[PDB]
Structure formats: C-alpha cells, structure tokens
Structure 1
C-alpha cells in the first residue's frame, strides 16, 4: 500500500524536440519552449527557405504581451521596436450593414450615421453588478436613446475617430489595446532570440520524408540535402499542408467550411502617407461583395488583404475588387494569394506529433485569432509537456484545451456573419444559411433574453481566458453593431431606479473621458515616431 519512489535516474525525458517550420508558429514555438525547458532539451528548427511562409498575420489580440512576450522576458517596447509595431484599439467594421461594392469609405445608414461600428478592447464598467451594455440596450429598446453602442459605451470610440494613440507621450496607458506588426520582422526577431539566447539549432533544408518506428511514432525527418534529424517529440509548424499531423500521422482535419464560408485571400502591403492622413490605431474590416478586406496600419505602410470565398468570387474578381479599393495597378502590384482551410484537426496532438499554428486549427483572420492560437497552444504544450511515456491523459487534456479554445473563437466568428443584414450578393445570402454550432445558438438565446454573454473576470486568469476569451462586451459590439438586439431589456433593470441613475453617470463619464483624451492624447502618428525614433 506504501508509496514506491521511482528508480534513481534512468532519464525518461524528451531529449530533442524537432520543430518543422520557420514561420511565426515555428519561431514562436522555438523561443517559448527554449525558455520553458531551461536548456534541458535540444531544440532544432527545420525550415525550407525554398518554401515561403504564408507572409500574413499582422494583427493581434490584447493578451499577446501577458501570455507570450512576458514569458520570454521581453518588454513590450523592445519587441515593438524590432517589428515596426503599431497599436490596435479595435477592429472597425465598415459597410457590413449596407449593400454594394467594396469601398474604404463608409456608406450612409438609413439613420444618417456612417456604416461603421467598432469592436474595442476596453473593459465595460458596471453599475449594481450589471455591465454598461445592458443599460444602453434598455435605453435603446425603451426608445430613450438613438445612440450607437460603441459611441455610448467606450471612450475608445472617440479616441479612434480622432486617430489618437492608446498611450500618452510619457507612455501612461489611456486604454486597452493590442498590436499591429510586421509578420516577417516578428519572425526574424524571434528567430534571432531563439538562436542567440535559447540555444536553438536552425537547419535550413526541406523535409522530404517523415521516418517512423514500428509503433508509428516519428523518429526523424529526412531532408532533401540528405540529413536525418532525429528527435523524440515533433512540433508540426509546417502550415496548412500539415506535413506531420495530417499527412504522416494521418490525423483527419475537420473541415468546417459549413460554419464559415471564406477560404481565400489576396494580400499586399500599401505604402501610406502618414503625414497627410495620420495612422489609424485600429484594424479595419471593410465589407466586400464576396467577403471582406483588412487594413492593418503601421508607420510608412498598411497591410491589406481581401478575404473571400472562392465559391463566390474567382481570384481575378477578388484581386480586381481588392485593387480598386486602394487604386493599385493589378498588373504591377506584388500580390500574395493564399488558400486557407477552416476547422481543426480531430486531435491537435497524436503520438509524438503536436500541431501548432496553421498546421492545427484556423478560422478566417477577422478577429486576429491565428497568433493567439499559436501562443495559447504553446502555453498548453509546456503545461502538458510529456516525457517518453507519452501519458495519454496529458495528450487528451492538451487536445481538449485546443478544442475548447477553437470552439470559443469559432462561435464569436459565426456571430459576425449569421447576423449580417446584407442580402445583396450570393455570399451575403449564403451566410444566413450557415450551420450554426449549438453553443453559439445557446449564446444568442441568452443574449436575446437580455442576459450577459460570458461576463469578464494571474496565469490562472489569462489561461482560463483561452476557454472563454470573447466576453459580454465583445458580443455586444458585434451583435449590436450588426443590428441584433435583445428581444427586451434585462428585466432586473426595471426594478432598479438607483442603478439606472448610476449608469447615467457612467454614460456621462464616457463622454467626458472621450472629450478629455481626444484633446490631450498624442496622435497615433506622433506616438509611433517617438517609440520607433523616426524623429
């Protein structure tokens, strides 16, 4: 019945981790595992210079510093300075409610206001344990305000309208934000960090064969040059082709193109006159006839790309509309054309093969969840990091975290499409026939009764976030943005005169703060120039 200590070592650890791929997923994995495993494991990154990375992935969500760069011990300003980073206070939705061609300029709604709505990262304040969203919704439904949700509930909206920064020049925080950054530069930065600070071995070669033992565990990757890179654990960061998880380990990908329709992008970088126009401290999502277009500003240039369904537009149609949007020469612009899959691996980790980044789960880039899926998956791999016994429970629990995180974001993205009121194109009409997951259906039913959807709540904190990342405030942004309202106000508010009065002060606070900050904050342009030392 007594505890029996396990033998005097006998070392049963993983000795070598091989990472296939040198995109952001590859080098993020290499940097983080390098930090996590304290020089007890050899880490090798195998990447083919000859096979281009996806060349996109430039907007983020606000937990990137807390969940990833903080673990590496890299302060915010330091990495920002190496990847021409900028500030993202929101995704701003343009022309999602009105029909017609793609235009960067908002059309006019029937109410006279521009067809824009923001999804900011600011926390919503509460009165009497009820978020400001609900007091707004009550007023809107009771015919007591005409005001838009984003305008009433976040000072951030005013700040973004004026293109001011989320920090003062003394670098005091004015609001919550996430980042824009140059994806190529981030990767190079993390590669240099991994190689020079975390002892990672960088092999520049192309995998041509995955070698397995009799039990079907990977033992090595054979390369075109004739190398055999032996390893105990393999991380598939090969991108969409999923060379280890899908091809060698034969793990099915779960196609969820019945949930979300976009599957293609045409992308480019657009030089930009920041002196003239300033810099928008937000990502724009510009609705198109057969999808949408991102705009991701940084100093000197904006990343842009038209995400579309190739069932509803050809590459040429897409490229034409994308080119017209910015006045690009279609014969003279350098376009990156990509096909993406939508869904997840049945299991993200099988045998000794862990998928991370585009080789694992993906939804379209509309709320910038790709990089988030990488560092969340990496965090979870470190937490469930195996030895050579590969305990099936570690594997299972990792897989369950990936599933939950994926499902949580998929729900949120489904909300963007299924409640669009556009019916002008086959694409917008097909988004009203989506296969809706039970869990988003349940959330909509909760929202429609006037109740909060996932009220908000430190590593225990940020990691729990992965299972329920998109909170009440974000759901209000998108539902209320698109025009979906509760059937009626939250009934409890009808009994709470004092609480309603309290929220009136919160509403007045949003106005006052917005006004103060628009006056006092620097332009995004001026703050970037200070930060990056271009002045």
Structure 2
C-alpha cells in the first residue's frame, strides 16, 4: 500500500488533483503540492463540460457555494457562429434528445419539421432569452433531472485555482512554493524525488506531473513520447484577453465559438467580465494579425487591455502514466478548446487515477488499462473536432479552403459517408469513452450542414402525430420556461 503523492504544478490540474485525492482518501493519503512562484499558470481555461458537476459533488461542494466564489456563470451549451452560412448560428446544448416511437427528435425533425436546435431542444430558448437554469428558489428548471439537462459552467481561471488550493490546504495538503530544478531517478528510471531551489529534495511514492505543456516529469525526465495532432488539427496558437462587459447584467448562459478568418474565437461570459480568445494557426496568420483581428472584434480602442499570447502543444502523450509518474492536464494532452475539454480531461484523468490507484506492487496491467482509457479519451475528441472543420461550410480564406481538403483521422471518412445517408448513433460514433454522447455528434452535424440526403424511410410508414405533438409540447414548455425563469445574471446576483 502506497502512502504519499507529490504533485508538481499549481494550475487548475495540480489543485483539482490535490483536492480530489483528499476527497477520495482523506487521511489515508499524504499529499504535497510544489509549484513555482515565478512560472505563471496558463491563465486561461474558463468553460467546462457536462461532467464537471460530479467533480464538485464529490468534493462536497454545492454550486451555490463554489460558483460565486469562482466568479462564474452558467454554460447551457455552445453557440457556433459564422461557421457555414455567414451571420448564421446554432446551439450545441447540454440536453438529451427525446425519443418518440423508437426514433429521436432529430430523425423526426428531418421527416416532419424552425432550425434543428430550436425545434428539438428546450435549451435553445433558454439561451436566446438568456435564462438561468434555476428558479430564484434554487429549483432546477427540469422540475436525476440534472442528467437530462447536464448544464456546465464558466468560471474565472485565477479564482478556481485560488479556491481549490484553499480547499486542498484546509484538508492537509502540504503546499510548497518553489522551483523544481532537477528530478531524481533511481536505478530503474523511477522518480525518486524532485529537487527544489530552497526546500531540498521532496520525495514520495507517486508523482503527478501538472507542469503544463512543459511536461517536466513525463516528457523531459521520463522521455515520454508526445504524439502531435497538427497534421489534422493545425491550430497551434492563441491570443487571449479579459474584456469587461459594458453591461454586466447582459450575461449569456453559454460560450460562443465564432469562426474567424484563420481560426475561431471564444467568448466566455463570467460574473464580472468576459473571457475572449482567438485560436489560430500561424501558418495562415501572424500573432499580431490575430491580436489585431481579435481586438477589432471584441475590444475596439481598448489598448489598456493586455493580450496573453499562448503557444499550444496539441496532441497527447503515448502514455500519460509511466513508472511512478502520471501526467494530468496540459502535460498529458491538449486539443484546441473548441468543445471545452481541457478540464474534462483533468477530471477524468483524476477519477480514473483513483480507480487505477496503485498498491505497493505497481501492477503494469492496471497501469496499461489506465493508459488506454486516456488515449481513447483524447482520440475520441480529436476525431469529433476534425468533424467540426469538415462540417464548416465557409470557404472564404486560405485557412477555410485548406480545412476542407486536409487529411482526417482514421474512422472519420466512414462517419461522414454514414452521415450523408442517415444519422450517426451509439454504434457509429467513436465507441470508447470520450465525454461526448450521440446527441452531440448529431447536433454538430445538423448545425454545420452535414445532413442526410433524405429522411429515414421507416418514418414514412409511421404515424407522424405523436412526434408532432412532441414538437408542440417542446415549443410550449419553452414558452413557459422563459416566462418563469430569471435571467442568468439575476439568479447569480441572488446567490452572491
């Protein structure tokens, strides 16, 4: 049985790990987290995926407690703007499709359908009317019912790290602020300790690499091989800003992904401000050009706002667990934030680390099974993301023209062939766990313009009444909800 964990890095990954380990094992694990006082955290990572409520539940934290305290907001979905038709948009919401007489509402929409998201999802209305997912009395709008509309969150990246470090430290995590200068290895190549500038050697049984893109343990010490995805997903840089909203009250309960001339831009509404960034490929546009394009769109004349330029490491380690070291966060893998998966990868890496926790024997088969899961997790998203670029109909710049013909991962060709005939399902999407469900694959395809040539032939043999009564039911439930629900900001104000 092993006793102690040493985490290197104090970004969102480090502090999520420290928190979760203490929540899981309490006093049956010793945890130390070492982080540099001079190497900054990435500074971004402000939108989350639908699994994140489980992370906070596991920690014993209600959203009323943790959300104001991370200066956050609600994420009901993502609004995709300008990807295909210009001025046009759709939502990818956190909401499962209803099923009528064996077929989901997407199939029926194609046969008897108003845009797809609008006809099929309550969430669409909530986004348009800028509603909170809760009534003022704190009851969920569905009124588990939380799974049927698995909304996520926006939060401030500084605050969440600050908040979780306090959570972890309150629970006995030893905190060291220092630079690791060298990582020791025993005669078998296993990590023996990390040598700091002022605190000597810090040893332990298990080491968690949370050093970001740098991969200081997993790559620079252990020689882990990093598999780049630049061949299919070229975006390799970002430029970020923190932009105050002219009107705080005007707060959207969703992230916006807006296609730009050489990439795309995020808008993440927080309680006090927006987060903004342009994800781009430097083969098509320079870092200044991108900064200029970004500022022009979301912050004209606001040169007091400092831009944060980021070089992204896109792809994954072949193995995120090597010897006694596990990489969590940007050190393990990263794909561009088009579907807000970075924090999801962290949560899933940590939840599966607890499941695959080593005993004094360090069982290689259990480690191997952990590595497979993490590989599948990222490869599924990678494929899902390439599908975004293949579905995007705009062709107006060298960038968008090149996205159309660029090589694809194995498997996607088949998914596109299928999709031109009929909708993807549980059996034809990526088959291993990667966060996303069928509705997400379908919703992107239909929003972007990858549509079956014709409706499902079976539906012509069937009574359309039950599905038409369902579309009407959705339309009426939507009407009632936007009338009864407070705004996104209103509800958040009431719980601050």
TM-score, reference length from structure 1 = 0.88
The root-mean-square deviation of aligned C-alpha atoms, in Å, is 1.8
Correspondences of 1:7-406 after superposition (within 5 Å): 13-66=1-54, 68-98=55-85, 107=87, 115-139=88-112, 145=113, 147-174=114-141, 176=149, 177-197=151-171, 199-225=172-198, 227-274=200-247, 278-329=250-301, 331-406=303-378
Q: Given that residues 154 and 510 in structure 1 are in contact (C-alpha distance below 8 angstroms), is that contact kept between their aligned partners in structure 2?
A: yes
Q: CA deviation at 1:367?
A: 0.8
Q: Given that residues 210 and 248 in structure 1 are in contact (C-alpha distance below 8 angstroms), is that contact kept between their aligned partners in structure 2?
A: yes
Q: CA deviation at 1:494?
A: 2.4
Q: Deviations 1:409-450 (Å, cap 9, x if unpaired)?
A: 112111111111111111111211232222333333333331
Work out which of the residue numbers 444, 449, 474 in structure 1 matches 2:421. Answer: 449
Structure 2 residue matching 1:39: 3-state secondary structure: helix
Q: Given that residues 245 and 359 in structure 1 are in contact (C-alpha distance below 8 angstroms), is that contact kept between their aligned partners in structure 2?
A: yes
Q: CA deviation at 1:331?
A: 4.3
Q: CA deviation at 1:485?
A: 0.3
Superposed structure 1 runs of 4+ greater than 6 Å apart:
none
Q: 1:420 is matched with which residue?
A: 392
Q: CA deviation at 1:455?
A: 7.7
Structure 2 residue matching 1:117: 3-state secondary structure: strand
Q: CA deviation at 1:399?
A: 0.4
Q: Given that residues 118 and 150 in structure 1 are in contact (C-alpha distance below 8 angstroms), is that contact kept between their aligned partners in structure 2?
A: yes
Q: 1:473 to 1:148 in 2, by over 3 A?
A: same
Q: Is 2:434 the counterpart of 1:489? A: no
Distance 2:272 2:303 in 1: 23
Q: 1:502 to 1:358 in 2, by over 3 A?
A: same
Q: Given that residues 267 and 304 in structure 1 are in contact (C-alpha distance below 8 angstroms), is that contact kept between their aligned partners in structure 2?
A: yes
Q: Given that residues 447 and 453 in structure 1 are in contact (C-alpha distance below 8 angstroms), is that contact kept between their aligned partners in structure 2?
A: no
Structure 2 residue matching 1:245: 3-state secondary structure: coil
Q: 1:308 to 1:349 in 2, by over 3 A?
A: same
Unaligned runs of at least 5 residues, structure 1: 1-12, 100-106, 108-114, 140-144, 457-463
Q: 1:467 is matched with which residue?
A: 433
Q: Given that residues 255 and 342 in structure 1 are in contact (C-alpha distance below 8 angstroms), is that contact kept between their aligned partners in structure 2?
A: yes
Q: Deviations 1:4-61 (Å, cap 9, x if unpaired)?
A: xxxxxxxxx2222110100000000001111222312211101002000000000011
Unaligned runs of at least 5 residues, structure 2: 143-148
Q: Deviations 1:45-100 (Å, cap 9, x if unpaired)?
A: 0100200000000001121012x11111112221112101111111001111146x
Q: CA deviation at 1:466?
A: 7.5
Q: 1:336 to 1:201 in 2, by over 3 A?
A: same
Q: Given that residues 14 and 232 in structure 1 are in contact (C-alpha distance below 8 angstroms), is that contact kept between their aligned partners in structure 2?
A: yes
Q: Deviations 1:335-359 (Å, cap 9, x if unpaired)?
A: 1111111111011111111000000
Work out which of the residue numbers 451, 463, 467 in structure 2 matches 1:503. Answer: 467
Distance 2:199 2:120 in 1: 61
Distance 2:16 2:251 in 1: 28
Q: 2:146 is matched with which residue?
A: none
Q: Given that residues 314 and 336 in structure 2 are in contact (C-alpha distance below 8 angstroms), is that contact kept between their aligned partners in structure 1?
A: yes
Q: CA deviation at 1:465?
A: 10
Distance 1:212 1:311 in 2: 39
Q: Is 2:482 the counterpart of 1:518? A: yes
Q: Deviations 1:295-348 (Å, cap 9, x if unpaired)?
A: 111222111111111111111000000000123446432111111111110111
Q: Deviations 1:200-236 (Å, cap 9, x if unpaired)?
A: 0000001110100010000000112251111111100
- Count residues in correspondence: 488
Q: Given that residues 423 and 442 in structure 2 are in contact (C-alpha distance below 8 angstroms), is that contact kept between their aligned partners in structure 1?
A: no
